[PDB]
Design a binder for this molecule. Structure first.
Ligand code: SF4
Length: 81
């Protein structure tokens, strides 16, 4: 499976990821992206049909703030660093 999460500390509120994958990423009041599937906890598996959109958003993020993994993040966007 695949899991995703936003490191909100490095996000620059550019708007690209919600356009590339609107069913996965949205923005808080401050314009900072988060994963709507699981309230940015990195615990809900991304549906198979959405993986291509997720990878588009991941590759397109200017500051490498979107994370992807094959194992849950359990709330920590920096788990795999
Ligand atoms: S693409 Fe990256 S920097 Fe831009 S809003 Fe999404 S997470 Fe933030």
């Amino acid at each position: 499976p695949k899991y995703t999460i936003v490191d909100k500390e490095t996000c620059i509120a550019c708007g690209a990821c919600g356009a590339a994958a609107p069913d996965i990423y949205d923005y808080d009041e401050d314009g900072i992206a988060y994963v709507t599937l699981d309230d940015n906890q990195g615990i809900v598996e991304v549906p198979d049909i959405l993986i291509d959109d997720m990878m588009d958003a991941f590759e397109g993020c200017p500051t490498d703030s979107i994370k992807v993994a094959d194992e849950p993040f359990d709330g920590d966007p920096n788990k795999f660093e």
